[PDB]
């Protein structure tokens, strides 16, 4: 029993409008450098589809995540320590630049410098950002399948269509599309960390953000295969890997991440979650993969339980963090309302970025239809997005928790309409799904009204604990190059001292 905290994220897919604003803001701030211009820490994919990189969900091809051996022990699908080491000269599974797309630019200056007397109007053609050579044609991009862009037989290769008879969905009337925005999961049992030979990847203790140390990374590029979500991108120029850093510079002072604060749809929720680090392996090694979801929920702790509060304190959790945890929207959607589900729990990484499945128009029927248990509003059975599809995505193929979330969402709707249109109290739908009036009203507060202060409840990472904030306040930022940053030993070959430190020791004790 060792309690740790992390700011989790829940995305309400039902509200996602597939706008990509989240992707653009992340790109502008973090990955506009040459080397990672093709990398999209945050990317949005339209489903059905194979995504970015192409078919990242196919673990038989890419070898991401873990596997539970027959002896019950966990091993990365990539192979054990030696197997992995024996693949280091050339990672046999490494996705190629082409699996993403070849980053391109256009020759705009040709519109400006086109010489006088040109036979045809000048134009700007594409050029490779990798070779600088002229590109005959752009044949791929990071969001190439946006809004069902491509033949159905192509998009349906989607790994999430397994065990589903998909023929019916190629018919115009049964068409359906949804959006899947994604970033790094910042897992409790990250495969990347387990697959990095040099140990450059780590999970921060105070907030669970997983980073790739840019000093220590050696560019062994195995972590990339290791991540089953393929959210680690190789910086082809620096030779090191980079990934979503959960905007730690902001989180550290209590701010939302950029993709969270900039989400036009107001679908992202940030809240603390307390977990028992000592239960991680036990939970991720459970025999049946349809249990990882529930096993993870069991790894999460109740913030209002004095037993947990006292243990958190004893274990070093700041008081403000415990408080933030007690009013965490992420906990309300994952633990109480059971609306949020993990992304591909079967990878056994214990993902910390969850999703609320989306609703969708009713399916095509013989006639205008009839009033179901929810009147004019939809019943869960009438939704056109095949629930089995959603289950392959969020619950390892188990449709029970998906239906439960969808049903409850519709229940809330049914109750609110009774209240606002009929001006009556009708809890028929709520009781059917096991929700109380109070729970429904609260669900409505967070999901519908979604005040800024309710979507983001981020505590400080308290950069002052166990460190020396005073000399840091006074000297950080003066980057003259003192050469003493990054090590604990004071001795340095250039005979220098830290600019943001006190080297004249007090002699008064």
């Amino acid at each position: 029993m060792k309690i740790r905290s992390q700011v989790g994220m829940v995305l309400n897919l039902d509200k996602c409008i597939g706008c990509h604003t989240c992707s653009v803001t992340c790109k502008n701030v973090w990955t506009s450098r040459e080397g990672v211009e093709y990398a999209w820490f945050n990317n949005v994919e339209t489903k059905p589809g194979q995504g970015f990189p192409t078919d990242w969900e196919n673990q038989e091809k890419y070898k991401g995540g873990w596997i539970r051996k027959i002896n019950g022990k966990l091993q990365p699908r990539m192979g054990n320590r030696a197997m992995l080491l024996g693949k280091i000269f050339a990672n046999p599974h490494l996705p190629g630049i082409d699996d993403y797309y070849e980053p391109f630019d256009f020759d705009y200056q040709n519109l400006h410098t086109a010489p006088e007397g040109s036979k045809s109007q000048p134009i700007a053609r594409p050029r490779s950002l990798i070779t600088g050579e002229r590109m005959a044609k752009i044949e791929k991009g990071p969001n190439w399948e946006d809004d069902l862009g491509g033949e159905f037989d192509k998009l349906a290769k989607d790994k999430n269509f397994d065990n589903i008879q998909k023929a019916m969905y190629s018919q115009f009337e049964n068409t359906f599309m949804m959006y899947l925005p994604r970033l790094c999961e910042h897992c409790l049992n990250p495969a990347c960390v387990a697959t990095c030979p040099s140990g450059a990847i780590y999970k921060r203790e105070e907030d669970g953000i997983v980073l790739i140390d840019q000093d220590k990374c050696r560019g062994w590029r195995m972590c990339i295969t290791g991540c089953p979500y393929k959210k680690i991108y190789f910086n082809w120029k620096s030779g090191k890997s980079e990934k979503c850093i959960f905007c730690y510079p902001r989180i550290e002072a209590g701010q939302p991440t950029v993709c969270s604060e900039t989400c036009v749809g107001r679908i992202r929720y940030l809240g603390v979650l307390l977990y028992d680090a000592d239960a991680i392996e036990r939970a991720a090694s459970t025999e049946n993969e349809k249990d990882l979801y529930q096993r993870q929920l069991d790894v999460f702790l109740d913030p209002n339980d004095p037993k947990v509060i006292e243990q958190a304190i004893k274990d070093g959790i700041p008081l403000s963090v415990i408080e933030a945890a007690q009013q965490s929207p992420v906990y309300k959607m994952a633990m109480e309302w059971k609306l949020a589900l993990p992304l591909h729990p079967e990878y056994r990484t214990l993902p910390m970025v969850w999703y609320v499945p989306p609703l969708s128009p009713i399916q095509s029927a013989a006639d205008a239809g009839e009033l179901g248990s929810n009147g004019i509003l939809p019943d869960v059975e009438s939704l056109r997005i095949p629930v089995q599809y959603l289950a392959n995505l969020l619950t390892a193929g188990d449709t029970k928790p998906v239906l439960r979330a969808l049903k409850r969402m519709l229940a809330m709707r049914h109750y609110k309409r009774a209240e606002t249109v009929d001006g009556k109290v009708d809890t028929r739908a709520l009781e059917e799904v096991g929700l109380t009036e109070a729970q429904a009203q609260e669900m409505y507060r967070y999901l519908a009204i979604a005040n800024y202060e309710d979507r983001f409840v981020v505590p400080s990472s308290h950069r002052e604990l166990a460190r020396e904030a005073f000399p840091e306040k006074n000297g950080c930022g003066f980057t003259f190059g003192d050469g003493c940053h990054g090590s604990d030993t004071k001795f340095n070959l250039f005979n220098s001292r830290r600019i943001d430190a006190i080297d004249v020791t007090s002699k008064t004790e």
Binding site: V29, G149, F152, R266, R282, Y444
Partner: protein, 1242 residues
Amino acid sequence: SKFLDRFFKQKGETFADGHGQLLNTNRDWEDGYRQRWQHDKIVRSTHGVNCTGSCSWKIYVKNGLVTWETQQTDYPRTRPDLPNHEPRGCPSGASYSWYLYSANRLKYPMMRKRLMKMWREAKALHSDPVEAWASIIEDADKAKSFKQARGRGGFVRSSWQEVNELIAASNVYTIKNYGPDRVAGFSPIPAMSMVSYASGARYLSLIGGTCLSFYDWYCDLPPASPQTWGEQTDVPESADWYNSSYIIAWGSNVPQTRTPDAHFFTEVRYKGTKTVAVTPDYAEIAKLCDLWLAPKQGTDAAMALAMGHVMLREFHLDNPSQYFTDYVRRYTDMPMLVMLEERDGYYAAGRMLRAADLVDALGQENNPEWKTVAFNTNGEMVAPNGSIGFRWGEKGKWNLEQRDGKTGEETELQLSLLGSQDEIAEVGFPYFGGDGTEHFNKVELENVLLHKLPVKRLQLADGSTALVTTVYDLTLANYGLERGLNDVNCATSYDDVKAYTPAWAEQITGVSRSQIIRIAREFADNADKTHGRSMIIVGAGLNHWYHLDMNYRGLINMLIFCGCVGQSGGGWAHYVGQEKLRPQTGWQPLAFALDWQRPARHMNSTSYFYNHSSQWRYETVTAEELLSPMADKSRYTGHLIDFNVRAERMGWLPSAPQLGTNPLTIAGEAEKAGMNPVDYTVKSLKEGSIRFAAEQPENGKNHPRNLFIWRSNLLGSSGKGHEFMLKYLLGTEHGIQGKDLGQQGGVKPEEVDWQDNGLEGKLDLVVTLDFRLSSTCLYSDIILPTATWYEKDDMNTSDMHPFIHPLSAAVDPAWEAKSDWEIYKAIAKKFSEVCVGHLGKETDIVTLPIQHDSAAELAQPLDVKDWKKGECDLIPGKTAPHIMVVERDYPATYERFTSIGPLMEKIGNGGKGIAWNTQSEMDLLRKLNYTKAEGPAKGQPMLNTAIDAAEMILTLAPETNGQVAVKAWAALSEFTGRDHTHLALNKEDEKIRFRDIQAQPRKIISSPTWSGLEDEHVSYNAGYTNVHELIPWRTLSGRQQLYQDHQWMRDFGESLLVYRPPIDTRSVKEVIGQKSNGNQEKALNFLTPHQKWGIHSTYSDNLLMLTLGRGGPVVWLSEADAKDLGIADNDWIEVFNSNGALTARAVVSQRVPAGMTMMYHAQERIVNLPGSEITQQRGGIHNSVTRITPKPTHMIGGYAHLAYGFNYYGTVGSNRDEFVVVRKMKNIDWLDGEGNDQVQES
């Protein structure tokens, strides 16, 4: 030493039974990302693009440069029961930062090399620049040498000194020798950047140049609105969607085109609201709804009619709804009496009965011919309050109080005459559901459906007699409702295939009849249960069809029948362009120099380009084929452009150029003729010694010569009939594929001169201001580097929310860029000196069409009279346009531009038919902007910076100054006789300042300029004031107009709505197969909904947007159509027709229904486009295949709600009816001499 650090100690406790290890090692490296996030400061700014977004952003400056942006989240929060707006934003918005130092930034003023060479050589022989310009423009080979260089490279770096002089010189020459109205400017949607638009508009107004329109030109103007409410466009705010319990997104892709507001839609669902999407394809909007209906594109009006049918049947006839009944009784023209005309064996609906028609004139001395009549429940006839006749000439009766216009007593209008008729008459109704192309299903009945209407005979004041009936009765018949008279053309069941039944529409639309019935029922039931909280969000999906009015009136009737308009949570939510510049009357005087001279030269752009880019010379549509079957065909002969010319001379629509003679010389000639200028012009117009320029657009003096383009990409976006603009306006190579009227030997117009070889290259000088080298720039003569939205001050408002916020300079404009405001200020300055000796204190004769909201709107009450045809005298301001006298002080242009004129104090300020005193505001402005020390404008407030201008707008507008807001409501109270000041009394002290909005966006003040309220308990909902304050809709009847009784409306078969199939542009059958490349060609409907990776063409060159999209111009096709054509996903394809051709790559998809193709709006002509195999030129753009085709009903003027107004009414640029030929390309030649060409096999 990191090396020494490698030397057990850093190992803490393990966890999870040895599965994990806690390390106590250095983390200093984390500073690496921290220092990237850190910045110098954040500045508040927004985007000056036409998106209706109006989102406030945080501009981050780091290392003294703009590096990125994130949304501001500090908007004043909405009520506790409503979700807030933060963070708003969209993808394009998030990528603007890219422009600032991108490879496509315009840094210096540029000039076509060929033009510069002749300029510098001409200046060496002519010390005076005006005469230097003359030496080049009056030479045929010189003029031609640079006009044919347009779009063909050769831009060289110039300087502000050089271009400012050439521009000024050219303007002077053009004004002096041809007329001020031969100089024009095009800039759209001022709400997105009020002062930036004002810059050019102000300079142009002062010098008399024409200011072209945009709302109608872009087809955002829904003519149906002016028709029904007498309002350009007023809609509820997005927040109000959250007060609705039933919403239908009809032809509106909310999540993609209203991104920053979508959440109100996804969230209101959790409140119990049901949502329904109506789109032919599986659009993004569908993903968010509970039901998806997919009618065949263009057939939507059919569905609406059917739904209206069910509603009337079920909630008006069978089980009448109290709420709906009272609602249509008091707020529509339904109880209004219509006179019946005698046909052959049957009657036809004529104009509406007027007080004047009755003997004692119902006691109406004032404007009796402009007041509608109805029957009260006691059988008595009466002229009810609110008719447009009570608006002018009298006071206190222009309201919706159900009272008798004579006695002033409380009456009750009766709806149907059924039950008190003197006999049953048979009235014929036009039916077009049987016509149409092969691409849309049709249903045969009769061109004229006869219905049995209950009537009453009246004894008219002129002795004769006539039959009458109510709009109501007429409406139920048009809808096919059986009322007991046993009408063979009325429905017997919803399955009966008759005039607008669910079964009928099922055939036209393809939407299951039961679906139509179910949703019609739910919608109406909801509206009944909530008192109008049903709403329809509609957009370009319907409004860009030639028959947009029918599509719209269909939706409008549904809402009116269910009493949804004017109620929070209900109504007509039209969202297209960002046309709601809230501080209207504070901005108008600034943008059109109305503080100095009145009036300015406004022009409706569709007619302007139709005429000058000569798109009429290729017209395939005839007015005759749009005529009602019950109209006298011989009374409407002529080319569609002939109706425009007549409309102009009758004072209905504006003109540009106005006259065939320099309007600055007319005064000197009246002086010699011994008569004043006005009278002398009317005498010449009657004599024909002076003619309207429209009559001879190619004689060499009636075509614009100088054009300014800014905040617009006219020649790569909005420009319908692109190839025609390149040929007739620019004089460069073009890709037009068809022959003109002359070549086909068709009938020439009867109002416009004809000449086989059309005049080309009419534009002498095209000047474009922009921050990126757009398609328009590429085809200009002079490019002026302007400041990005992150480098200047300005303001922005939108229809979506009530906040007014600013654009601010994060840093000074980079390189040699300047804000639009400073560019025009400098030009006006050089103009003021260059003009000395050529222009002084001139006298200008300006024509001004009859204005809506002015007393003159009451022009021709009963019919149409063409003075040129001798049907009446030429009376300016009534049967022709006003002929105004305007004095211009050309040398003082700059001083006037940089100061607020004396007219605000002398005459006052106002708008929308009301005026108030604005002296106190001017005194405040003298203290805030300081005053001119000397010169012509001595003592007047200053306008040096964009900020002074912004402050001018804020201080003068009632929306941003409570003081003015009260004087404004006071003014309107004189008309209605009801107090409206209470709407703003509790905010009278309120005064919005520019610097305050930089600190935090501010909510505006309820103003008479609009019909919604800015309140803390009720959201902003259009028409709320009419319904709750009893203020009339500026329509003939004062109520919402279901019946249009204008001669033209009646004869073009649109007195009542009716189904109209998409028109045939006949642009395919003449070129299909004429240039085979070996691949199969097929005809498909060409739709251009607005894109996801940009806003129009802006952002289309933005690498971020291009990388998230498909890397350049693309076109969507159904899988079936692509497979038939042998087209694979991403193959190079060519789309073309009579108007031109374009090249692009295909996106094959299942969500695209067979029969249609979509090239998401504006991807323009500068990125990734190969040569055409059809024109042998650079591939064209989406508007290379479209062509303007005006509609007569949109030219109607001098008739109450149907009277002109800048962006209020006028012809529109529809384009969804268009068809194209599609095919896989073969040879992919880039025409760049790179030798990097390809060939697509099979």
